[PDB]
Enzyme design. Structure first.
Site, mmCIF file in Angstrom:
data_model
loop_
_atom_site.group_PDB
_atom_site.id
_atom_site.type_symbol
_atom_site.label_atom_id
_atom_site.label_comp_id
_atom_site.label_asym_id
_atom_site.label_seq_id
_atom_site.Cartn_x
_atom_site.Cartn_y
_atom_site.Cartn_z
ATOM 1 N N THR G 1 34.886 48.348 39.225
ATOM 2 C CA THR G 1 33.544 46.976 39.003
ATOM 3 C C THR G 1 34.283 46.641 38.539
ATOM 4 O OG1 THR G 1 32.174 49.199 39.288
ATOM 5 C CG2 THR G 1 31.693 47.648 37.718
ATOM 6 N N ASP G 17 30.434 42.626 41.071
ATOM 7 C CA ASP G 17 30.891 42.967 43.025
ATOM 8 C C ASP G 17 29.398 43.782 42.617
ATOM 9 O OD1 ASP G 17 31.620 44.936 41.164
ATOM 10 O OD2 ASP G 17 31.991 45.686 43.192
ATOM 11 N N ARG G 19 30.062 47.245 45.407
ATOM 12 C CA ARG G 19 30.975 48.365 45.204
ATOM 13 C C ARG G 19 30.529 49.619 44.844
ATOM 14 N NH1 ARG G 19 37.573 48.080 47.679
ATOM 15 N NH2 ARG G 19 36.145 47.686 49.803
ATOM 16 N N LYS G 33 24.389 46.412 39.898
ATOM 17 C CA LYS G 33 24.155 46.842 39.245
ATOM 18 C C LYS G 33 24.184 45.789 38.027
ATOM 19 C CE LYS G 33 28.884 48.080 42.172
ATOM 20 N NZ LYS G 33 30.619 47.699 41.272
ATOM 21 N N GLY G 47 31.353 52.004 34.596
ATOM 22 C CA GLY G 47 31.422 53.539 33.680
ATOM 23 C C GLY G 47 31.041 54.722 35.216
ATOM 24 N N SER G 129 36.567 47.626 36.641
ATOM 25 C CA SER G 129 38.563 48.017 36.322
ATOM 26 C C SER G 129 38.956 46.220 36.846
ATOM 27 C CB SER G 129 38.534 48.692 38.685
ATOM 28 O OG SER G 129 37.664 48.604 39.318
ATOM 29 N N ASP G 166 41.270 44.305 42.888
ATOM 30 C CA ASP G 166 41.196 45.048 42.975
ATOM 31 C C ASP G 166 40.522 45.549 43.530
ATOM 32 O OD1 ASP G 166 40.694 47.639 41.118
ATOM 33 O OD2 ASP G 166 38.316 47.095 41.149
ATOM 34 N N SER G 169 36.720 47.180 43.056
ATOM 35 C CA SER G 169 35.877 46.567 43.745
ATOM 36 C C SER G 169 36.069 45.860 44.744
ATOM 37 C CB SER G 169 35.389 45.347 42.090
ATOM 38 O OG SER G 169 36.153 45.919 41.273
HETATM 39 MG MG LIG Z 1 38.960 44.992 45.992
HETATM 40 MG MG LIG Z 2 39.665 49.078 52.304
#
Ligand SMILES: [Mg+2]
Ligand SMILES: [Mg+2]
Ligand SMILES: [Mg+2]
Ligand SMILES: [Mg+2]
Ligand SMILES: [Mg+2]
Ligand SMILES: [Mg+2]
Ligand SMILES: [Mg+2]
Ligand SMILES: [Mg+2]
Lengths: 198, 222, 204, 233, 196, 212, 222, 196, 198
Positions: G1, G17, G19, G33, G47, G129, G166, G169
């Protein structure tokens, strides 16, 4: 664990060993012989860890058989047993100890008397009238302590074993599928094939 | 305490066609949530018309691959340049892996090529040597995502012929390299969507009687 | 030990053109031992279906709980609950037990009787909602399911086709799961009608 | 089976159209105490290779000793020691990788993360990483420790893919590296202000800048911050 | 974290770095660790950000009320409140606080409430991870009844050292001057303290 | 995994399933759990795949060496004691394997030895090993008669597996059959359990609880 | 995240983001989010998702009530103080890490709350993250006095940092701008860079492919 | 333990407190932590007394032999030995040593071999538990090429501080001066260092 | 653990339960009854932790008896079991859970059909033709799956049971001292006192 009992009457030694081999959740075999003939007048019964059990037995056999050839003589039960104790006493302080217990019944052709030796995995050896390993003692000793007599006949002992085997089948939680009995006397080693009913 | 092992993600897939085989692998190399490299091949040509990939912990993958390639070199030495047949190669690897049975190569390796009859062949190994010849096999992170699909689209599992009340299984027609590749690509895109470790690039090695051919495609970079 | 992997089981839900589908396998087991091949994990309160995978006692409990809840809801409101609404109900119901959760993984599917817009949703054991328009999966073979779905799925499928798709998804995914299978059930839901079919599959 | 003691943090690096740049601060930390301030962590090997090392210092000092001997020993019975048969960055790497992988396979690792940056005799830029586990990988940019989390994202903005390398000038690359180093001073508690940078270009050869400092820092805004919520003054 | 409060002729000054870390990551490099619990009673915070923020918020409240009812609270009282909270809840707290305040009859006063929840009144106090390094420097250069100017420097020196050595400390140096004349906020940048 | 071998009139029946799992994940449905040691001896797989595949393949070699040294077919007893003794050498290292060494020689007749990584070597008439053992034992025990015909016996083993493949989650895929005779063993196919369950259910009438 | 909050010359913007991941699996390739606490107070969380949603809705509700009762627009310091006292109450167990931004009568505000109940204030912050990739960008391009447009770009790029670098994310970028004089504008999918490419084949099964055993109509009505 | 070695104009001086403790018990209060490994190469020992006493004993010999065959050893050499021992056996040691020596070409030189077995050459070094407290005072009051008198004092102050704060240090201050002119032993009692 | 088996034929539900009670090393009793009659047409067998086992069954009993009185009616087996499930599902999250497993066999007088329910200590309830708890399933299911038929007579079921018990005595490690069998049918609950030999 398995049942290993031995009782030396006046002219012989009788050994009884459970006939069951359990591996985990199932009973693999109901007809195992947990004994090896060391010499024609000495037998050894054994109980303990899966592999160590047979491996140790066979190793001891071989070595006793070899002495028999090299010397054209049959070691006394007493000898045979001191030999075994030492081997066990050596393994307790090794890399990986044989987890084995044995009973050695033999007829000493020289003294003309029967002999029963009890040795545990630690190399603790003792000579007794009757003996057993593990919990087997717990259930039967009270019976043995009560009915045993030095002057018992082969037949009197077989009955005492029977009464003992009965108590085990009554109070012990695991089914050891019965016992195989053998007698060691002056004429050799025979298997009382009548202990399912005698 | 020191942990001698790690995980670098990645996913590979070997498929054996009637007269060819493919060993495909994504190109991403990662550590935890970081991307170590968007381009670090993992499927290699070991010579002798043999492609192999050792996926898992990159160090072990590396070492193993090296030892094998080298094993091929010596085989030629000690046996007057005899070509190493895929099955021979396979039994060899069993030995390589198993040699480290008490400090294993933390990898799932696969190798592909042609067997002696000229038919496609794929073999796959346990991190300790267990191995078997296979039709198709995925390995790594997204194995669990790619396998069921392949079971369906390749071996036509659960699919039956329309109007037979489910008593006639779909006919096992055999796929062409061109078709297999589609499935591979898809397998990888799908995997890329649902698995964070997979992505960046797909490199495929195609093995045929004519030698070893490489194709590469880009994948999503998030 | 992971309560979510003792009884085994999977559920999947997909949306198509004016319809939604939701399927589940039927195995109920205790670790390796298959115990029952007749444990449907899909339930409905009117025109809303809830699929639940996870520890079976909890699957049972929750089902019992939502009926109860949807029943009173109907009495007070004088109308049947809607997907979207149920969803928030499930969520809030799960977070209620945030520190001693029901080890399950719910999937909601239905069609709003007023709007006609197909709807599915999913949650983790504590209410974290996942609302996607494509598909939702839950169970021991979740990874498998995602793989199948991501590949097999395409939007706006007709009831007849969605059926196949979801069945296949479910079927092959289950075949790669130890703790799943022994039978499967698929519901094809449309505004006016709902068809339920059992699938033939490997019994191992 | 050890535990690092005195340590060095990130080493960042990237490759540009004509060479490579690598940089690393000059700190040797003893846990949370920034104990040693004059620690060079870029080890030039010859006129075409720089090895940047992070991790345990005693182990780095050992790798130093090892690299010198590599040079010495390459001179031996080698009349072409400073030409065709001189150490290539690739040779040095492989040696290192191998050592690392062996030390880990014997459970007595060289607790480090190393980046070997250099240029091969034929012109190719060389950039490759290896760590205490024998793990190795290559990419247009590479960084260890925090640099990996912070520096790579920045550097990758300049060189996202291979094709971007030939489009990057030293001016650019150097600027990037310097900015990254600045970021790390801000965000990495174990960083130090003074660093060292080295460029290995296929023409100018090896340029090794010592004693650089992070400059152009934004801190003024810290004045308009009071309290952690409702405090007004 | 590096914090100290020094009492001088005209009152007392509180200084502290501005770095809050989560491991080796600098989560916040412009943190304000100088907290107002009352008009002329401020505290320096070392330990769990969460634990201290809370304790502060609570003391601030207890004091607001104290005021409403009984007028301006002494620093000794501000301390007692902090102590009470820290001591009674010792099992669940990781906080070391320095309370410094100004009063017309008492001039400046400084109290340190260490981990166990005890309270000690001192001429100055230092605390935080970086404090270890400057016990020597401080016990050496500190003289009582210093001028504001002198005091500012002593704090600026001690803390630049602490920031030098401790990695858990850095950023800017913040100070707060509490004298009869009022409250002054001071800020010194790295570009200045780094080379002294 | 489920593997059985039982002794009878016409020889030995060895039947095994073919499923391998990694947790709840079915890694393969096409594993060969019968290691063909050599044309006369059969070894089964259970425990560690590598351990069995490897050490039994090796066993295959040691037997060959023996047959060159002594110009006589190695006895199963001997064949098994080698594996057994080898296995006992590593006891404590973590080998995982439980297998049946099956063979039919002139001297011994048909013979089955159970050998495991604990160092156990046992001679018996019927043995099942694997997570699905109890299920196969159940069927075997009740329909086992020495006077069985090769055809029925094959079936019995085939079924016993079926039994286990149904109930045990870790067994399934397909059944592989082997008949061991004195002139060697004969493979009796690979039977996909999917197709086999339906057929057997229909024909035999069992598994009634299952709908189909 | 990856979530960031960037304050500009006359407002504040926050982005994130899209995801959601259960372990290494992309569960929701586009979850939201960005939560609304009050019309002009939004927060982004990372979290335990269920916790960020719960603590959000709970406080939002209590915030809606305090407003009604005081006949005053909601204030950020209140949302802050409430979240922080609740999170702190639960000694870290409510794994909610939030960046709460918003405008109110006193001006614009941007704060961050860590699950243990500690808050911070700054002109730019990020969490998740992707926290470091994003902070790397902010620490490189942020300047005092950004226009509404500069801040959006900035906050937008930062999220991209996390998206590409990352594994935690990805997918898209959501933005929410809270300008002082105006209404808050929630830009859902302000950016959409990760679109899966067209599959290489159609897996539309031919009807009847599946094997059915029993069919029946389910009754929905009463 | 508090030990430091400071190089100055005429060479180098090594100083240390004199307290060895087992827990909170002062086993020996008049320990000598200044060890001669060669005529003009001494070292300061911190850590396990068993580990360091041994290492020293071994280096001393290594150097005695070095001398016999190749003449007087440089300090960098004495250090390379220490490092070698310390690094090669890191797993089984808890020793931190400072080596200080005098040479005519190099004047004074100081090396610190920290726990990991790495080596660092510096103008002066401090180590031991008591070192943490004086990093600030030392980094401030140290100037290069100072006089013997000034150096003695700097060392006498830093160590008194260390002794003050650290419970693991105390007793007397011992110094060893290494210059062209020879070797001088200095001792300073508590009645003097305690009030500076 | 103990053995608990049930099999519902066409007109009744047969339940067999081991007769042994083991406490540590010895077999205390060889004639225990691990079942309680809930209502005159519903029986419940049980196996689990020492006290919990009886304490739970008796509780259920009392509670089902009280309902029969308060209402002058006999709950359907289905009703009786849901109640039991709920009581178990409640204890799994209590301070100290009842570690108990039970089978519920009842003849539903209203429906005129036999019913067998299996419910584990967790509240996992399921309805089946035959079922068991613990390891009992592992040995017998293979047999049940093979020979079971919905139209079985009470006699056919008892034989199938016998066979199942046989297998258990053959492959199972512990001696459970035989079983006690009960049939639940329209006329009530009777104890087949002939299962030692039938
Ligand atoms: Mg990524
Ligand atoms: Mg992938
Ligand atoms: Mg070949
Ligand atoms: Mg999951
Ligand atoms: Mg399955
Ligand atoms: Mg199965
Ligand atoms: Mg600092
Ligand atoms: Mg002291």
């Amino acid at each position: 664990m398995d049942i290993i009992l031995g009782i030396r009457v006046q002219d012989s030694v009788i050994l009884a060993s459970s006939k069951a081999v359990t591996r985990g959740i199932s009973v693999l075999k109901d007809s195992d012989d947990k004994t090896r003939q060391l010499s024609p007048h000495t037998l050894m019964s054994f109980a303990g860890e899966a592999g160590d059990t047979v491996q140790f037995a066979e190793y001891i056999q071989a070595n006793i058989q070899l002495y028999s050839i090299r010397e054209d003589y049959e070691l006394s039960p007493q000898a045979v047993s001191s030999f075994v104790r030492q081997e066990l006493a050596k393994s307790i302080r090794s890399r990986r100890p044989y987890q084995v217990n044995v009973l050695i019944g033999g007829y000493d052709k020289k003294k003309n008397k029967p002999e029963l030796y009890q040795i545990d995995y630690l190399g603790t050896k003792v000579e007794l009238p009757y003996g057993a390993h593990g919990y087997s003692g717990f259930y039967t000793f009270s019976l043995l302590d009560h009915h045993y007599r030095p002057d018992m006949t082969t037949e009197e002992g077989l009955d005492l074993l029977k009464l003992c085997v009965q108590e085990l089948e009554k109070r012990m939680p695991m089914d050891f599928k019965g016992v195989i009995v053998k007698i060691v006397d002056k004429d050799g080693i025979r298997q009382v094939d009548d202990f399912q009913a005698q | 305490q020191f942990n001698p092992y790690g995980d670098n993600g990645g996913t590979i897939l070997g498929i054996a066609g009637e007269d060819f085989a493919v060993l495909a692998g994504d190109t991403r190399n990662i550590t935890d949530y970081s991307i170590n490299s968007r381009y670090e091949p993992k499927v290699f040509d070991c010579g002798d018309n043999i492609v192999m990939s050792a996926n898992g912990f990159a160090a072990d993958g590396d070492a193993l691959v090296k030892r094998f390639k080298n094993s091929v070199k010596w085989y030629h030495f000690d046996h007057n340049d005899k070509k190493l047949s895929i099955n021979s190669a396979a039994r060899n690897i069993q030995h390589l892996l198993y040699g480290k049975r008490f400090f294993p190569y933390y990898v799932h390796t696969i190798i592909a090529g042609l067997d002696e009859d000229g038919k496609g062949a794929v073999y796959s190994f346990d991190p300790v040597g267990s191995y078997e010849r296979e039709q198709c096999r995925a390995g790594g992170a997204a194995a669990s995502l790619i396998m069921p699909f392949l079971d369906n689209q390749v071996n036509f599992k659960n699919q039956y012929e329309p109007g037979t009340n489910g008593k006639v299984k779909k006919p096992l027609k055999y796929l062409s390299v061109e078709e297999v590749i589609k499935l591979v690509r898809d397998s990888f895109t799908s995997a890329t969507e649902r698995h964070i470790q997979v992505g960046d690039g797909l490199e495929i090695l195609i093995v045929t009687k004519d030698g070893v051919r490489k194709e590469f495609y880009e994948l999503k970079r998030d | 030990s992971d309560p979510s992997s003792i009884n085994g089981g999977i559920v999947v839900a997909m949306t198509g053109k004016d319809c939604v589908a939701i399927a589940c396998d039927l195995r109920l087991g205790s670790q390796s031992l298959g115990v029952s091949n007749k444990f449907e994990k899909i339930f409905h309160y009117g025109h809303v279906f809830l699929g639940i995978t996870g520890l079976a006692t909890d699957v049972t409990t929750l089902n019992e709980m939502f009926r109860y809840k949807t029943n009173l809801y109907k009495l007070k409101e004088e109308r049947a609950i809607e997907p979207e609404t149920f969803t928030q109900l499930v969520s809030s119901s799960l977070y209620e037990r945030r520190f001693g959760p029901y080890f399950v993984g719910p999937v909601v599917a239905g069609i709003n009787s007023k709007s006609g817009k197909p709807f599915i949703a999913g949650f983790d054991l504590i209410g974290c909602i996942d609302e996607a328009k494509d598909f939702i999966v839950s169970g021991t073979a979740s990874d498998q399911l995602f793989g199948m779905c991501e590949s097999l799925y395409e939007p706006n499928l007709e009831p007849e086709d969605l059926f196949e798709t979801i069945s296949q998804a479910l079927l092959n995914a289950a075949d790669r799961d130890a703790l799943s299978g022994w039978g499967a059930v698929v519901y094809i839901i449309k505004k006016d009608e709902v068809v339920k079919r059992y699938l033939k599959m490997r019994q191992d | 089976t050890q535990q690092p003691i005195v340590t060095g943090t990130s080493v960042i690096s990237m490759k540009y159209d004509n060479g490579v740049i690598i940089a690393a601060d000059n700190l040797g930390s003893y846990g949370s105490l920034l104990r040693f301030n004059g620690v060079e962590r870029l080890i030039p090997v010859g006129d075409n290779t720089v090895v940047g090392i992070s991790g345990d210092i005693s182990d780095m000092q050992h790798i130093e000793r090892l690299l010198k001997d590599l040079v010495t020993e390459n001179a031996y019975d080698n009349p072409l020691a400073d030409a065709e048969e001189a150490l290539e960055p690739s040779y040095i790497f492989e040696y290192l990788a191998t050592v690392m992988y062996q030390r880990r396979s014997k459970m007595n690792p060289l607790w480090n993360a190393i980046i070997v940056a250099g240029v091969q005799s034929n012109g190719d830029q060389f950039l490759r990483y290896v760590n205490l586990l024998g793990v190795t990988y290559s990419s247009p940019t590479l960084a260890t420790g925090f640099g990996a989390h912070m520096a790579n994202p920045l550097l990758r903005k300049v060189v996202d893919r291979e094709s971007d390398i030939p489009k990057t000038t030293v001016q650019v690359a150097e600027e990037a590296i310097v900015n990254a180093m600045r970021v790390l001073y801000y965000r990495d508690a174990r960083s130090s202000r003074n660093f060292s940078l080295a460029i290995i270009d296929k023409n100018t050869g090896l340029t090794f800048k010592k004693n650089l400092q992070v400059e152009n820092m934004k801190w003024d805004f810290a004045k308009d911050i009071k309290g952690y919520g409702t405090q007004k003054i | 974290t590096s914090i100290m409060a020094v009492t001088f002729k005209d009152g007392v000054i509180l200084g502290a770095d501005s770095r809050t870390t989560t491991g080796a990551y600098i989560a916040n490099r412009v943190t304000d660790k100088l907290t107002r619990v009352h008009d002329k009673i401020w505290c320096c915070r070392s330990g769990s950000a969460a634990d201290t923020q809370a304790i502060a918020d609570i003391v601030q409240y207890h004091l607001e009320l104290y005021t409403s009812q009984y007028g301006t609270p002494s620093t000794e009282t501000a301390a007692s409140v902090f102590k009470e909270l820290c001591y009674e809840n010792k099992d669940n707290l990781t906080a070391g606080i320095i309370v410094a305040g100004y009063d017309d009859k008492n001039k400046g006063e400084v109290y340190t409430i260490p981990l166990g929840g005890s309270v000690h009144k001192l001429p100055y106090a230092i605390a935080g991870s970086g404090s270890t390094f400057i016990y020597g420097y401080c016990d050496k250069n500190f003289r009582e009844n210093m001028s504001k100017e002198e005091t500012v420097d002593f704090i600026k020196h001690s803390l630049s050292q602490a920031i030098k050595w401790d990695g858990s400390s850095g950023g800017v140096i913040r100070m707060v001057v509490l004298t009869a004349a009022g409250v002054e906020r001071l800020i010194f940048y790295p570009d200045e303290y780094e080379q002294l | 995994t489920t593997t059985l071998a039982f002794r009878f009139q016409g020889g030995i029946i060895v039947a095994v399933d073919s499923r391998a799992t990694a947790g709840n994940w079915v890694a393969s449905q096409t594993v060969k759990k019968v290691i063909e040691i050599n044309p006369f001896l059969l070894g089964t797989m259970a425990g560690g795949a590598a351990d069995c595949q490897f050490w039994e393949t090796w066993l295959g070699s040691q037997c060959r060496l023996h047959e060159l040294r002594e110009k006589e077919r190695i006895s199963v007893a001997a064949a098994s004691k080698i594996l057994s003794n080898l296995v006992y050498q590593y006891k404590g290292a973590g080998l995982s394997m439980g297998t049946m060494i099956c063979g039919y020689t002139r001297k011994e007749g048909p013979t089955i030895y159970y050998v495991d990584s604990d160092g156990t070597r046992l001679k018996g008439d019927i043995f099942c090993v694997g997570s699905g053992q109890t299920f196969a034992y159940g069927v075997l025990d009740s329909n086992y008669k020495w006077d069985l015909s090769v055809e029925d016996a094959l079936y019995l083993g085939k079924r016993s597996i079926l039994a286990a493949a149904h109930r045990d989650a870790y067994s399934g895929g397909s059944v592989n059959l082997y008949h061991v005779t004195e002139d060697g063993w004969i493979y009796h196919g690979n039977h996909d359990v999917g197709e086999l369950f339906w057929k057997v259910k229909e024909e035999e009438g069992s598994f009634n609880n299952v709908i189909g | 995240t990856t979530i960031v909050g960037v304050k500009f010359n006359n407002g504040v913007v926050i982005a994130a983001d899209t995801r959601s991941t259960q372990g290494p699996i992309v569960a929701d390739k586009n979850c939201a989010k960005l939560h609304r606490i009050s019309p002009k107070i939004w927060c982004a969380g990372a979290g335990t998702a269920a916790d960020t949603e719960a603590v959000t809705q709970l406080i939002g509700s209590n915030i809606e009530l305090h407003s009604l009762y005081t006949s005053r627009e909601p204030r950020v310091v209140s949302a802050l103080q409430m979240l922080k006292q609740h999170l702190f109450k639960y000694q870290g167990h409510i794994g909610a890490y939030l960046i709460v931004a918003g405008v109110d009568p006193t001006g614009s505000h941007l704060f961050s709350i860590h699950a243990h109940g500690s808050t911070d204030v700054g002109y730019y912050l990020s969490l998740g993250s992707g926290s470091l990739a994003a902070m790397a960008v902010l620490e490189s391009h942020w300047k005092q006095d950004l226009t509404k447009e500069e801040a959006i770009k900035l906050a937008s790029d930062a999220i991209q940092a996390g998206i590409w670098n990352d594994l935690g994310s990805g997918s898209n970028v959501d933005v929410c701008v809270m300008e002082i004089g105006k209404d808050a504008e929630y830009l859902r999918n302000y950016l959409t860079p990760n679109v899966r490419e067209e599959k290489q084949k159609s897996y539309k099964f031919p009807r009847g492919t599946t094997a059915v055993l029993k069919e029946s109509i389910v009754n929905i009505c009463d």
